[PDB]
Design an enzyme around this catalytic site. Structure first.
Site, PDB file in Angstrom:
ATOM      1  N   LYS C 158     -33.977  -4.895 -90.353  1.00 25.73           N
ATOM      2  CA  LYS C 158     -35.326  -4.587 -89.966  1.00 25.73           C
ATOM      3  C   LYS C 158     -36.112  -4.437 -91.201  1.00 25.73           C
ATOM      4  O   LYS C 158     -37.174  -5.032 -91.368  1.00 25.73           O
ATOM      5  N   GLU C 184     -36.623   7.073 -93.684  1.00 23.14           N
ATOM      6  CA  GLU C 184     -35.761   5.976 -94.041  1.00 23.14           C
ATOM      7  C   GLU C 184     -34.728   6.422 -95.032  1.00 23.14           C
ATOM      8  O   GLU C 184     -35.008   7.296 -95.845  1.00 23.14           O
ATOM      9  N   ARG C 185     -33.518   5.807 -94.983  1.00 21.54           N
ATOM     10  CA  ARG C 185     -32.335   6.241 -95.693  1.00 21.54           C
ATOM     11  C   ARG C 185     -32.564   6.217 -97.175  1.00 21.54           C
ATOM     12  O   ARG C 185     -33.393   5.453 -97.657  1.00 21.54           O
TER      13      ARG C 185
END
Lengths: 187, 507, 470, 469
Positions: C158, C184-185
């Site tokens: 994504k 987000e990571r």
């Protein structure tokens, strides 16, 4: 533990008050002073309900307390600590609630057992006396614990009387007997 | 009508009596209600959040609610010791654990006491349970293989060090066995040297019975792998606070490996049981949200935990804790709140399918529902080359297979796929508790992908695999040495391998 | 003013209640700072509860808070820094440099909350954005000023899709972009940082045509919720006060929903359907409405959305579905078929595919493509089971062209020289229209199917025919 | 100086006391209120403060007058244990309800006890043969293990358990505990008679079995501490007498249910479905108080009434966690008529490994599982399109599988009456051999109905002769 634990919130205040003044004695004094300031509180209209009702801060409440101890300087000090408590817990709508409860505990401590003889009409003084005598000579108030008894007039009751105290009642009214009679001949 | 926690009659009467305590409102405080293992103490206004508080009974309890007068201290012990009106004296320390290399060969409880009772921990430090995740600047991109020795895992969903790869699937599908296989393959590095090329494995067991754990240690002792593993355990019996604390303190143990710059791997089995424990903890705390039965903020708990595993830069000593969460799925419901949350956090899914377990892939990995977002960059260079169209073949097999069970007159292309596909699935089939060396996974995938086994009959594929490896061990052991040594397949090597495979088609 | 001091009364999760004194009340949506050995804990004032006691949400971890700890009031909503210095510098939720370049700030700060632009302000777009991604360009045309929406599965490359958009579109356009990442990571963060250093869009010796606000999900739920607002205001500064066009990017807005759901439950609000916040609609609405093309500027959002368990009937995707102008669906299946873009063309819908807007020729060609593919999908069932041979000559030509078209969609991505190796191709809008028309006519039905596969334009397709021929 | 108190509240069977004395009995202490019907045993469960504990009431409430005298018994209810427990059916309070008169107490132990240590645990692996065909082939039991059923109809569960008692406990010579939590009084009477009849209880003689029986009519709170009592009796044999024991627990869903019932009243906002927000901890303690320590081996058998047969319900789920092997019994297989009703695709045992029961055993089982899974897989196709119109390869599989399904049957001995078929008990060694042959299609050539509701391969051959007539 206090004579008669009524339990209930706001009566936790009363219980606390009772035991606090019980262990230092002078409960009658406390009660009397509390009554006196309470009475003039009701008879002062702003802070008779129009400043007993919340809309005040802790700090604004505190300044209300300071005015209260101006109203009768020297109450009994335990009830001045109670005012502080009430300010801090910011309750004052349940001020008269505590007053009534402290009275119940107090007059229980005194052993003055007030009762009531609800009736339809004001009764004879001979009737008052005879019922009081009977009640003192009954198992219900064996006496040892003082008897106060109040006849009250309630129109809803149609004839007869009901004697009440100690959650023990003799209900010998006319209205109820009529009700039962009507019902049984409607069967 | 308001009811305040300060309206407790003993407190209230003391206030009316004028004189009231202080200092028992700093460093001490008196219990007043306590039941359900959740105390509420009055006092302690010097308490810091998350602190450990020593009950005079001797119970230790962290404090998770600092309420407007009554500190809600979650007991680590049974409340049959604690009783009302006790004094509690603040430890003054948020929880901390001993961390060291002495944890190697130790089963330890949450507070770091050897429950295997192999005597004192050789602790090179103490650490704190919460340690915030290393930043973007501390991170450096993954470049380190982790070969689980399961062919499907390595080939299809490769794992590297620092990665977050979620093992998800139905209850007691030998969930542990999937993980244990990775640990067993870490024997290969363990035997070797360069300690940062070794994964020091930490198996975290939450909510599991002592007997299960005991069996695991027996298996590990059998494979002599306890000689490099740490088992952090919090059995079902052990307190719900201790269970809640168990993953975060396991993480701290992991960070010690990271700090040393060494690489390690942490199996968090089951995070689902952590979530149940946190559900019971939260509700017993009067913690307001049901959350669909799991309280809001469970995602915050899991997210903070998982992001403390990362591949760090060489100016951070090139450390890397790798994490493997394990999530039980209640009827395979991945839309359940705890499963949904975890899926987002993690960088892979390793879905296990029950039907395929029965179908004979054991372990069975439903490759459709398995992803590894990070993907190849930890897959062996050779193994990447061979398994390049393994994914395509399988994907085609899946479509074709659906048609195939309606068993109508087959398109020639479809029955080519069908025949090839059938062999491929059978080729993949794993045998529990028996890892396979990557050097010897490269031949098998070469053979299969280059269609040498497409012809070979389905039944005797299992025989073929064993024999092929034996044949190469006998004859082309030079080739195997090269695959091991050079890890990418040269033209000559590919041809050599092709010639060898071709010869072994007819045996 | 003078210090507005509050004393904590209850630390119970993110909810931290403070006891400000009388006549020094804060206001809903102010920002309180508590000095900590962690720097400054920021608490966003979210309720007044009575007697000078507010209920505030934490933005930093709540560990080690000592009861009755002095709480300063900034006096207003979280005040970020805004500037052209925001470009090429990374700042965390409370607007503090996590890129460690020290002070970031021009001359201004702005509040994180800002009122939606008025009906009067609105100005309708019609410009057609070019992504260079052929499938997108023809079959779901994007528009400059739009509210593009990347609905798709779990991180299904994504980030990669978004990265390609940033790589192509950002350098190509002259505007700014804002990349905002909601939880987000940190692996993804490091990759993005590295990647845009590599693509040089982030150039630390020069300016950057993008700013970064990387939000990390280790940050408590409250911070996760209001990271979006922070980024949004930077975009507003660009749109308004720097007057320029922008190309906002938010990632992933399902995380925005999740974060909000959590602090709703922490606030004690009765959760709505599938546990999602009762205030879900208005919160989504506030974010979405704020982003719009005004006459002061134009801002083109691309908002990633994660469709949990690929079910968009789930209310959180569905609520977002209304707010976004130009939906795009990325499908696992199409990815698995080996087609990268993973965009499923028939499932993507863009209401910018209006015939006049893209011109009649574009419209007609795209209608023909859509029909051709839809026919092919219908015919897939017949070919598979019933057989390929029973198909008509007409059907067979449509299928053969469709397989070619299907793999003509497949084009490489420059940021998937890492995820593949094949260099990407930016294909002109006109060129794409032309190339698809040619295919439908079968002008290149003398070209192998695989010579359409994973290549750019027609010129490349022809060239790859020669390569396969060799 | 016994702690006196008053009964402040009686909100259900979760009575609250207010001790007048400053002495406060601790959590899990026990109190006796002397009832004019006997006594009521209550167990302190919360301290709510202001000298008001909140107590679980273990006997049927009614006629309680708020203010009634409390007396502190102190600590958990301490039952009396000994060898003298053997040959007694004892109530929750431990008093013989089979009117064997008061137990000659040796050691009296508190019902609650801490669960044995990690160090204490020792892992067994010995096969325990059952003789049930499905059990032996698919999920071989082990001695000392924790065995599990997940039935939905108690009518089947009781029979299954009865068969297990009939086989295993006669072979077993050590002590054995039957603890029946919340089960039918009539069924309990049947067991008592049956046990007395099969001499395991010999009242005049000696009994190597002891019994604790908890009727489902008993108030929920009573049912909660029936289990803990049984675990104590078991612990006494396991530890103190050292003997290798057996234990049967049925229905342990009732343990869960009882907790769920009290939970609301206790003042706990219920967790999902309805199960108590203390479910994991309560279950955990119970299932870790059942153990095979290095001081003894207690084979335990647990029976779970899965409510609505939904295994996905959290309460059955948390039961699944603490069991070594499970043999889920389901309504579908019951409808198929097969007794035993064990699901063959929903059974597992830790001992199913080939390192335990041998590769040949494992291989045989593997084929059975695969075949049946195929058969389940083609059930859709079979209905939509004729079974005739399936592939030739598949039709062999289908025919084999129909045979396998029928083969799995085996009349029970205890329920030989109920089935109406003389019981069948078949050797494990025989079972592996028999299935091996059938899988090799050796006996595939004779009626499908010949495999139906009958035992061993030899019997199938004979039933072919019977059918042939």
């Amino acid at each position: 533990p206090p004579p008669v634990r009524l339990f209930g919130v706001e009566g936790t205040y009363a219980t606390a008050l009772y035991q606090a003044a019980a262990k230092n004695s002078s409960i009658d004094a406390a009660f009397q002073s509390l009554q006196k300031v309470e009475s003039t509180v009701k008879k002062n209209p702003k802070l008779g309900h129009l400043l007993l009702n919340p809309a005040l801060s802790l700090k604004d409440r505190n300044s209300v307390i300071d005015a209260i101890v101006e109203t009768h300087k020297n109450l009994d000090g335990y009830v001045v600590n109670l005012l502080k408590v009430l300010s801090e817990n910011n309750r004052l709508g349940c001020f008269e609630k505590i007053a009534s409860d402290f009275g119940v505990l107090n007059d229980a401590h005194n052993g003055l057992l007030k009762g009531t003889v609800t009736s339809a009409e004001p009764l004879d003084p001979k009737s008052f006396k005879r019922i009081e005598k009977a009640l003192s000579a009954s198992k219900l108030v064996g006496q040892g614990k003082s008897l106060k008894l109040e006849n009250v007039v309630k129109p809803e009751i149609k004839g007869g009387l009901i004697v009440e105290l100690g959650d023990k009642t003799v209900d010998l009214s006319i209205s109820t007997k009529i009700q039962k009679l009507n019902k049984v001949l409607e069967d | 009508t308001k009811a305040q926690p300060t309206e407790v009659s003993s407190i209230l009467e003391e206030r009316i009596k004028g004189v009231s305590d202080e200092a028992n409102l700093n460093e001490t405080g008196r219990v007043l209600a306590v039941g359900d293992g959740i105390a509420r103490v009055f006092g302690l206004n010097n308490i810091q959040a998350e602190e450990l508080v020593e009950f005079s009974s001797g119970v230790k309890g962290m404090a998770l609610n600092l309420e407007p007068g009554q500190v809600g201290i979650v007991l680590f012990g049974s409340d049959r010791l604690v009783k009302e009106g006790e004094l509690v004296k603040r430890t003054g320390n948020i929880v901390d654990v001993p961390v060291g290399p002495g944890l190697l060969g130790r089963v330890v409880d949450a507070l770091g006491n050897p429950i295997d009772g192999k005597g004192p921990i050789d602790a090179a430090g103490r650490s704190r349970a919460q340690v915030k995740a290393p930043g973007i600047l501390p991170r450096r991109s993954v470049h380190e293989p982790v070969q689980t020795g399961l062919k499907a895992v390595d080939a299809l969903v490769p794992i590297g060090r620092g990665q977050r790869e979620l093992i998800i699937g139905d209850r007691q599908t030998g969930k542990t066995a999937v993980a244990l296989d990775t640990i067993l393959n870490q024997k290969r590095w363990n035997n070797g040297s360069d300690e940062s090329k070794k994964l020091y494995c930490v198996y975290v067991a939450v909510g599991q019975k002592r007997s299960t754990v005991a069996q695991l240690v027996q298996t590990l002792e059998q494979h002599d792998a306890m000689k490099y593993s740490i088992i952090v355990a919090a059995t079902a019996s052990e307190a719900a606070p201790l269970q809640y604390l168990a993953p975060f303190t396991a993480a701290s143990i992991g960070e010690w490996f990271r700090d040393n710059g060494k690489h390690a791997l942490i199996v968090y089995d089951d995070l689902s049981k952590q979530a149940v424990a946190y559900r019971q903890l939260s509700l017993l705390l009067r913690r307001p949200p049901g959350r669909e039965a799991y309280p809001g903020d469970v995602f915050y708990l899991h997210s903070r935990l998982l992001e403390r595993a990362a591949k760090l830069s060489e100016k951070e000593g090139s450390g890397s804790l790798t994490a493997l969460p394990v999530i039980e799925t209640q009827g395979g419901d991945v839309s359940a709140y705890i499963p949904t949350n975890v899926i987002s956090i993690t960088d892979g899914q390793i879905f296990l399918e029950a039907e395929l377990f029965y179908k004979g892939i054991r372990p069975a990995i439903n490759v459709g529902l398995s992803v590894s977002r990070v993907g190849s960059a930890a897959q062996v260079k050779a193994l990447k080359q061979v398994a390049g169209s393994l994914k395509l073949f399988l994907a085609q097999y899946r479509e074709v297979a659906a048609f195939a069970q309606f068993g109508s007159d087959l398109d020639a292309s479809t029955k080519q796929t069908l025949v090839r596909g059938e062999r491929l699935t059978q080729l993949l089939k794993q045998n529990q508790y028996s890892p396979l060396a990557t050097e010897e996974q490269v031949p098998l995938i070469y053979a299969g992908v280059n269609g040498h086994l497409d012809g070979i009959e389905l039944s005797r594929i299992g025989e073929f695999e064993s024999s092929f490896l034996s044949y190469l061990k006998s004859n082309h052991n030079e080739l195997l040495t090269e695959i091991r040594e050079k890890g990418e397949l040269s033209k000559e090597l590919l041809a050599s391998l092709k010639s060898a495979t071709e010869s072994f088609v007819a045996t | 003013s003078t210090p507005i001091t509050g004393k904590v009364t209850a630390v119970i999760g993110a909810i931290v209640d403070v006891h400000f004194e009388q006549s020094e009340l804060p206001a809903i949506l102010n920002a309180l700072e508590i000095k900590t050995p962690q720097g400054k804990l920021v608490l966003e004032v979210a309720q007044h509860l009575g007697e000078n006691t507010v209920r505030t949400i934490a933005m930093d971890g709540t560990e080690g808070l000592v009861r009755g700890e002095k709480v300063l009031d900034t006096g207003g909503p979280i005040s970020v820094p805004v500037g052209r210095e925001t470009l090429g510098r990374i700042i965390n939720v409370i607007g503090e440099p996590i890129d460690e370049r020290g002070p970031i700030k021009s001359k201004l700060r702005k509040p994180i909350h800002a009122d939606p632009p008025s009906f009067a302000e609105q100005s309708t777009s019609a410009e057609i954005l070019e992504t260079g991604i052929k499938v997108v360009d023809l079959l779901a045309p994007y528009a400059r000023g739009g509210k593009i929406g990347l609905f798709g599965g779990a991180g299904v490359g994504k980030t990669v899709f978004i990265q390609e958009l940033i790589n192509n579109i950002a350098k190509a356009h002259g505007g700014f972009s804002v990349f905002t990442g909601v939880g987000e990571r940190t692996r993804e963060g490091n990759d993005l940082y590295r990647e845009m250093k590599e693509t040089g869009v982030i150039n630390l010796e020069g300016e950057s045509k993008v700013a970064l606000v990387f939000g990390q999900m280790n940050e408590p739920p409250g911070a996760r919720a209001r990271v979006a607002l922070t980024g949004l205001t930077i975009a507003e500064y660009f749109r308004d006060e720097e007057g320029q066009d922008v190309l906002l990017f938010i990632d992933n807005i399902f995380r925005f929903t999740q974060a909000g759901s959590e602090v709703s439950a922490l606030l004690g609000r009765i959760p709505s359907a599938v546990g999602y916040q009762p205030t879900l609609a208005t919160d989504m609405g506030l974010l979405q409405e704020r982003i719009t093309t005004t006459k002061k500027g134009s801002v083109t959002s691309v908002q990633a959305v994660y469709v949990p368990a690929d079910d968009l009937t789930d209310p959180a995707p569905a609520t977002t579905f209304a707010h976004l102008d130009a939906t795009t669906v990325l499908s696992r299946g199409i990815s698995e078929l080996g087609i990268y873009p993973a965009v499923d063309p028939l499932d993507s819908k863009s209401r910018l595919l209006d015939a006049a807007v893209v011109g009649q020729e574009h419209y007609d060609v795209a209608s023909k493509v859509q029909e051709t593919l839809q026919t092919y999908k219908s015919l897939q069932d017949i070919i598979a089971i019933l057989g390929m041979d029973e198909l008509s000559e007409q059907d067979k030509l449509t299928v053969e062209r469709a397989r070619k078209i299907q793999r003509f969609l497949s084009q490489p991505f420059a940021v998937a020289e890492v995820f593949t190796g094949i260099p990407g191709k930016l294909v002109r809008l006109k060129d794409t229209v032309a190339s698809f028309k040619a295919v439908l006519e079968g002008k290149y039905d003398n070209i192998p199917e695989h010579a359409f596969y994973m290549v750019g334009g027609i010129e490349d397709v022809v060239a790859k025919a020669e390569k396969l021929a060799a």
